[PDB]
Symmetry: C2
Subunit: 372 residues, 2 copies
Amino acid sequence: IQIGGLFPRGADQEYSAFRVGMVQFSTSEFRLTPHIDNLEVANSFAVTNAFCSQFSRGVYAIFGFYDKKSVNAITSFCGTLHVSFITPSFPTDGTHPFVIQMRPDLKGALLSLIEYYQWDKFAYLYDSDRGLSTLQAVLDSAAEKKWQVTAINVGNINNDKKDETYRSLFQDLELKKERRVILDCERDKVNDIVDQVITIGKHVKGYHYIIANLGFTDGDLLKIQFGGANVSGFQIVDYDDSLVSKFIERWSTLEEKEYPGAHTATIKYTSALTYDAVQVMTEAFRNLRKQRIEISRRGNAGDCLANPAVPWGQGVEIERALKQVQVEGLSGNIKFDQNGKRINYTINIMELKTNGPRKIGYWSEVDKMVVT
Amino acid sequence: IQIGGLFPRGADQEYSAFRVGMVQFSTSEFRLTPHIDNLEVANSFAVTNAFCSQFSRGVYAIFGFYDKKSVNAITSFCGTLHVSFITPSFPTDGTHPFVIQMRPDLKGALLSLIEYYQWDKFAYLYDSDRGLSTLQAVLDSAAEKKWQVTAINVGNINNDKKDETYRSLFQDLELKKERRVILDCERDKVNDIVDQVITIGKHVKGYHYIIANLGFTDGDLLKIQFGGANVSGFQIVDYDDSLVSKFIERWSTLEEKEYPGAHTATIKYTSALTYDAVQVMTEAFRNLRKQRIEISNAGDCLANPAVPWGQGVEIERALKQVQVEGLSGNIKFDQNGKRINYTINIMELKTNGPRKIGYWSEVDKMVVTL
């Protein structure tokens, strides 16, 4: 069963996690065979081309990553042609079809926590790249719950004055005597920022930071474990989980030059979801034999732009099979709604104490109350 | 010289403005011949297909429109393949190449005005559909100049509870006793917002509204000329201008069934820029003979590897170094296709009518009261 892979450049850990999943989840009676393409995922042209190529090859589904600058390109083609796209990238805001979204929604949990700490005046530092879905919720709810949010787009600082203007961003932000802050950026920025918070000595007592992403332990927490600032975040990989322990003991011992990014004690949530994604995909094709469904080409349709666009017949079966999969993985309960969004899922709430990161509770999609 | 046209559906006025420009700007020695495609511009699939169609036809440039949804699709293909795209849609935030952007940047002017009125607590009503480029500029600043902005995305209200929830959005917005307000919506959402403002009687004295777009007179401002509320906005078409008067006399008398959307006293700024766009293109191809530059089988846009059209950059250059006067005044571009050396009239709604109370220069950058 042929599938396509659209991996960003230097998505090493993720590709390794993907290959590991391939080995583990494929069997004798059943083997996925992926054609992998590596590309600049923010380039809509590159992405449209990568898609159209796989479409001629005759793939049945596509595992991939997309970016704010390329998401519409990919979803529009998937939706139009009935190719299902499975992805660990950010969930789409809209109810798009033929997109199975492995990443859970953080908007929900982040708002509950802001209330849990009973904040009502803070700062919000967002990266334009991530998608801006969350900026709005914080703003929408700051109207409702009357918060005084101080939003600043931080994604448009170039390496040139990286350290120079970050430092002077607190000569602009100390103005409102701002103490509680939320970080919503790609890991490279999050680190780049923390580094700067320390350098200027705003990691001391009196400051509280929330890391708006799903991998709290994913990066280097240590550098501020002892400044005296409060530091909170989210984690969808429970390393206390049996399933996850068994995984890491193999992962931590992989040939680091055969599996780049491996041979470590933690795994990035994106890499985790990439691996869980191989499980979901394999299971949905096993359920398509277990319903004696013929999803095979009897013929091949090769142009991405043929007009009129005629959707693949079996396309809708494959979308269904995927969305009605339920398994347990590195991210716990994997279960989808009609729109390919994740449900019945849990996010650990985390605090950075002096001994280390602590799971202080969880956020259920259902209960929805930070449970402690 | 062949060019492509990518028009949204029911972009009537704009297409008419386009055809008019075609007539007057083309000569004996020089004729642009457009292949026109009408499409759902928010559909990146549709838009990419259309682009690729024109690309095979062998067009030299493309005039068109794009949507927050579909802008990356377009710019990405244009950038990659070296086809130049001229457009009246919102300017791109980046420095994308091969995009000549006819619409000036409103971020600049809007911020100056907020200071001119010396506001520091207001509401900002934005439309998701337009793009959130401005939402940031306002918020980035609200940090800097310590404003207390109350932002609300209003683009995700469906026709069902249109009136129902707009009204109850001031049962949520009267909370902060909110009196100054910025509207950043399409004309359609703008007038809908305005009617509701009147229906509930918040168009009275004590309220001040700023209309964040380039067509202050473009819609019906009369409905609230006399409520007693302050109402300000922007205008890039100066109807007092000689060049524009000559235009409207013709425009206002066109066969309304031969030129839909015409036969009126005002013209929408998009239609204006559409028309100005025919001038800019025309000019740039005339300057390409006036430099004895040769440009002339095209191929598949999905050909791999992508090989850029050789003459492509020449055409991008010619376009970007064009300077003329049009319905929007001084048309002049920087290296990035963005507009420069331009002016925006500042406008207030008085009881006799809208009044040009000043201007905003890209250079002076004052709100330059007069």
